[PDB]
Scaffold this active site. Structure first.
Site, short mmCIF file in Angstrom:
data_model
loop_
_atom_site.label_atom_id
_atom_site.label_comp_id
_atom_site.label_asym_id
_atom_site.label_seq_id
_atom_site.Cartn_x
_atom_site.Cartn_y
_atom_site.Cartn_z
N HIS A 153 45.51 86.02 108.09
CA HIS A 153 45.77 84.59 108.13
C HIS A 153 47.14 84.27 108.75
CE1 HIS A 153 42.61 82.72 105.24
NE2 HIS A 153 42.19 83.93 105.57
N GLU B 179 33.28 83.92 117.89
CA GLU B 179 34.42 83.70 118.77
C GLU B 179 34.06 84.08 120.19
OE1 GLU B 179 34.92 85.33 115.69
OE2 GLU B 179 35.62 83.45 114.79
#
Lengths: 407, 338, 407, 338
Positions: D130, D61
């Site tokens: 999530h 990322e």
């Protein structure tokens, strides 16, 4: 009973204050010992080179080996001109720091060859992603000293409008990307810039920089990975000066390894080069640049040198290492070494030396006078407070409008 | 007994005490070992306790915090350092995703009794990356506990308390207050701690309870919620305004001493929140929201907040940024207005 | 003119839906070819082994070479038992997932040898730091299936009280560290656990786990650096299953490189092993553990294997890779390969094999039944909503007290 | 013309449009290329524009955002993705210390016209990693722009708008709203977008202005300030309570549409803040603080906020966590009490 108790291992510099450093840990090589591989050499076939030393100028100042080929003395001259200017400038700013004319300064004493060296091997359009210690790059591209110093002063004339700490320069026209205090971040950024150049079918390359200490930072590994994955036209420069403030490079993970070694590991052709041999710096830099520009891939160079000066004006190296450490550094002084060589082949002299020193001393003193005419720490002559809210966004948003109005 | 200490010496003492108290306590971070820290805060500790207990670390924040999390899982009590609060960001993942949630997600099987000391705050010509106040980056993380002292006494006590706490503690240290108190007047050269109240620090073990705020200046006119350098700013500003403002040093940012706060505003009827951190979504907004929730009817005026501008910390414009006695003072007058 | 337009390189797997993968890129070796170094080998001398393959079992299932010494048939039988259990558990849990009894699952089809192999080489007290794909460790360590399926169901009987997504297990008593959704984080945490063990002069070691794709994450580099700087007693495991969801290992930085190689680059002794050769997995793991327990330092192992099944129960591999891909993988099936070998040396037979299969089928079915007694997805039978606020902090703080009463 | 689209299809279209409209636009991230993204959001984009414009990235990322910052420095317009907002953390340093300050610290020499799409939000049995809503980790960053759509039309309009904006934009996409609107009732199986208002997406280029909120349900009793899934949660809770609440979808979190907010509350005399993110120091706190500042006197009652509990997002207790119509409706009655 069967297994002896495990022990945490903590590396220590052989040299501490009141002792003498044992510079054996530097795996060194004699001048001309290391070969010059082809620009298309596969990364894997670069392993030996990651654990040796590309070096041209020997003890007596004579050039040896394949890295000595095709070296225009005019470039060495610009090199000498670049290193001296850098060093003299450095000296000057430390002084203006004491006399409270400047807030903060970091020297690059003993490392002047590296930035300048590579800068001269690149094109002005090849953007560099420097740390705070590659002012030599700015010097080798002849950036206005007045504007450099103005930034160092946060004048009414600071190009960065006093938004940024002294030395955190930014010169887009000079191919010198805005410095950030945050370590390592620029290394990844360089790779991205190269990816962009590749994406648009351009021919410019990125020049990335990082110190020994900062290689432990996560953006170091991110850069190698991305440089490798996409075969980006980057030169990845690790400046191993043996130190990170008070921390010896062994704590950075240098013990029994090399930083050049980590490039081979991620499939990037890697050189480890004498960082105080200007010719070698120029020769290695040209190679990497040409490799990149041909579209043959990224390169990692570990520049072996020594941080001769204090970490910064706030630092006192005498509190963690021998005071006379530089005197014993096997690779000596870049300026001293280039000087010996440049004289011996007859493109330099004590005369040109003394004059060139004299002219740069004059040049800095003048620019310092020129810059101070626009303010100091003492003088409240600084950029406006209303400018403090500009450029946070492209258009001053409502909330900052209120915040400026309320001042 | 007692010794006169600076914030630096107090924090150092706290670590020296706990380093002795508990075998599992370990101190590491960048330049923390031999050199004793870029702020002296760990001087002599390695000499006294050995490299196995106090040591130098590679320049890797996620590495530092990450290994610490592993060390905790084993059963140590890592007190780990990050040179400047501005450089915690690379450890964000280890901090939010792991350190904060280790107890919750394992149903207590593994814990992270860690302490992260991060020198914070501006007012020292630090610039963009030597002076930010990222407390709002932590207070919002469920499972963390954020603390910031304002004087040597509380610095030692809150630190010892923090290290002993079994919850992960972000221990923010205002470097502006390292050598002496600071009110926001750069004109008047700053005095050391020895010439001030609260530099008298006990040599041995002691604590300052977490979740307990401190009334610095008792008042009846306005409740002033603040911490760190702005405590001394609020104090001086209270004196210059004339306004009889009650100055509360939250000490524990979150979780906080909710009662002490509500009690002050309930009596007062008005409050002003003061912090160095930038305005939008800073810690001040939660404080404003909390007061508003519990002190709505007793509220004689809108809750004000004097904070740093919504802008990255500048260098040259330092004193136009930092919320000083003047800028705070104006707000004390503004709230007292009909 | 002079220079051609630069082009961005983007790696592609040789096989896509409707093709056949060319598994040539796997730098493969014949069984017995790779030498077995002494446990005290220097990391630098491990460079060749990082670019080859440690393999014991040949195409005929005969054990070849130096890694084939001191191998207890009983350990292998425990290995087969562990692998069979893992696969049968997985298949059954995939069924339960489709029948909406469970919310989500991830198979380790084809990777059963790795986890189970290292598990049997370590001690129960050596803490492993697994990803979501090392359930074979739990099976090698004989963890309660009832308690595992419970977590999978988020039951009233779930050990994590429904706080965690299925498969994110936590079993301290079996040396199985709480699994996190965030990739790579555990790889660093492992090193620290080892550093801790070293600080206290213990003899326990740490077992780290990470996948190919996840090596790109920053904590991978962090781990290697810290493990190397401090000589931490860790086994650093990279499971190279060729895939990261849809991404081929080449986009992770595996093109023309190995992941083992990155260990050598950071000065850690590194091995590259056949992940489907249980004998090699045990033998390599034993060696790494022995190196570690003797205080000789960390080890990196790249396990070369193939992700035989879908990435998760939410995945369809047929959209990005050939459907028949597993059949073509040169290293075959771990269970299939050990079976052949173990029969050939007279410590296994179709009979035991068919029997062992039968019992684990029964055990899992019974276990699933014991577990569903305590709730399921349909059955609102889950942990209380008030246990939701516990364990956020050691003692539930006031605001959490309020929020709980508010429910 | 116009096509019926889901949020996924609208977002995919927005990138398809801008990818075509601007040569400098680039799209990458994990599984974004060949496969078309784990949420279908980039299907066919690589096939259509080639590898050099749309491609798969490694799992990094910080690398994804970091290279993007470099690309922007060069002069490209990167629209980059992070699989789940839950996983932005490793890029915190690149986001805060680099992307957000690039223009400021360089005085305009270098800019970062980047866009990070991060799917966010719960209500899907996502669990801890999530389903989190980290908008407060961005709104507090000086230099960033935070945007979150709540329907296909807005999704495309705002995405095209964000991509073109020369400021870095954190583009949060509520994955709960991907296939259809979701009111919080899990009992009632969810309908697709095609059966719902705002699925009529123009094929070509168009925008939805940044900094502009939108009244979803015109009301007089209470001002409900929200975004994302909770928009539809508020609309249904408003109907269930009976309370004539004005539901405001902020759309742009920060900077926001201050006027539309102040104006509603000023008319109404009361407001409720509703969002998925944890209470403490969430974005709600800033909203309350702003409302408290500009509507103090018109305020007929304390500003309430209905949010996710200060707890890491659980799995089994999903509906116990997520602020549903029941819990939101209860707060709608509470404010309407004397």
């Amino acid at each position: 009973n069967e297994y002896a108790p495990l022990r945490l291992h903590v590396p220590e510099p052989t040299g501490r204050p009141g002792c003498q450093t044992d510079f054996s840990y530097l795996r060194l090589n004699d001048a001309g010992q290391a070969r010059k591989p082809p620009v298309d050499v596969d990364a894997a076939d670069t392993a030996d080179l990651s654990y040796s030393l590309v070096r041209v100028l020997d003890e007596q100042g004579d050039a040896q080996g394949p890295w000595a080929e095709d070296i225009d003395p005019q470039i060495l001259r610009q090199g000498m001109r670049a290193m001296l200017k850098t060093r003299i400038f450095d000296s000057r700013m430390v002084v203006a720091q004491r006399q409270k004319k400047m807030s903060f300064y970091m020297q690059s004493l003993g490392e002047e060859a590296i930035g300048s060296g590579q800068a001269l091997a690149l094109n002005r359009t090849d953007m560099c992603f420097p740390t705070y210690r590659q002012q030599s790059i700015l010097m080798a591209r002849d950036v206005s000293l007045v504007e450099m110093i103005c930034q160092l002063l946060s004048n009414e004339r600071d190009p960065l409008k006093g938004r940024q700490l002294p030395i955190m320069y930014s010169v887009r026209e000079a191919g010198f990307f805005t410095i950030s205090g945050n370590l390592a971040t620029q290394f990844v950024q360089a790779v991205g810039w190269a990816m962009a150049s590749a994406i648009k079918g351009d021919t410019k390359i990125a020049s990335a920089w990082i110190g020994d200490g900062a290689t432990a930072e996560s953006d170091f590994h991110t850069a190698l990975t991305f440089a490798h994955v996409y075969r980006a036209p980057v030169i990845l420069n690790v400046v191993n000066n043996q130190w990170a403030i008070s921390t010896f490079q062994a704590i950075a993970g240098g013990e029994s390894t090399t930083f050049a070694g980590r490039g081979v590991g991620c499939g990037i052709a890697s050189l480890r080069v004498d960082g105080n041999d200007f010719v070698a710096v120029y020769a290695a830099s040209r190679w990497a640049a040409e490799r990149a520009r041909r579209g043959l891939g990224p390169s990692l160079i570990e520049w072996v040198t020594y941080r001769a000066g204090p970490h910064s004006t706030s630092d006192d190296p005498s509190k963690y290492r021998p005071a006379d450490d530089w005197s014993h550094f096997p690779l000596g002084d870049p300026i001293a070494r280039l000087k010996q060589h440049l004289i011996k082949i007859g493109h330099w002299s004590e005369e040109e030396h003394q004059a060139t020193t004299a002219e740069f001393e004059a040049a800095v003193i003048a620019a310092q006078k020129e810059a101070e005419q626009y303010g100091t720490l003492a003088n409240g002559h600084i950029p406006s407070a209303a400018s403090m809210f500009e450029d946070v966004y492209k258009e001053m948003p409502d909330h900052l409008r209120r915040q400026r109005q309320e001042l | 007994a007692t010794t006169t200490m600076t914030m630096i010496q107090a924090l150092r003492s706290a670590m020296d005490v706990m380093l002795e108290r508990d075998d599992n306590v370990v101190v590491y971070g960048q330049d923390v070992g031999y050199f004793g820290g870029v702020f002296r805060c760990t001087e002599g500790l390695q000499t006294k306790y050995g490299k196995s207990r106090v040591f130098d670390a590679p320049i890797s924040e996620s590495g530092i915090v990450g290994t610490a999390v592993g060390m905790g899982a084993y059963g140590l009590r890592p007190v780990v350092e990050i040179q400047f609060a501005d450089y915690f960001y690379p450890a964000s993942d280890q901090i939010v995703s792991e350190m904060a949630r280790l107890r919750y997600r394992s149903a207590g099987e593994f814990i992270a009794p860690l302490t992260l000391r991060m020198p914070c705050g501006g007012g020292i010509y630090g610039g963009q990356t030597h002076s930010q106040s990222p407390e709002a980056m932590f207070t919002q993380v469920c499972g963390l506990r954020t603390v910031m002292p304002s004087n040597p006494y509380d610095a030692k006590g809150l630190l010892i308390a923090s290290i002993e706490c079994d919850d992960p503690v972000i221990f923010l240290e205002p470097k502006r207050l390292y050598n002496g108190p600071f009110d926001g007047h750069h004109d008047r050269p700053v005095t050391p701690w020895s010439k001030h109240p609260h530099s008298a620090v006990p040599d041995g073990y002691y604590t300052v309870p977490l979740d307990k705020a401190a009334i610095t200046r008792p008042g009846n006119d306005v409740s002033v919620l603040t911490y760190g350098t702005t405590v001394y700013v609020a104090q001086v500003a209270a004196e210059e305004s004339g306004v009889d403002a009650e100055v509360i040093d939250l000490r524990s940012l979150w979780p906080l001493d909710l009662d002490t706060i509500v009690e002050s505003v309930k009596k007062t009827g008005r409050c002003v929140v003061v912090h160095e951190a930038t305005r939008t979504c800073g810690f001040g907004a939660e404080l404003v929201s909390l007061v508003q929730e519990h002190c709505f009817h007793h509220l004689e005026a809108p809750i004000e907040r004097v904070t740093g501008w919504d802008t990255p910390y500048p260098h040259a414009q330092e004193w136009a940024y930092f919320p000083g006695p003047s800028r705070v003072g104006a707000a004390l007058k503004k709230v007292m207005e009909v």
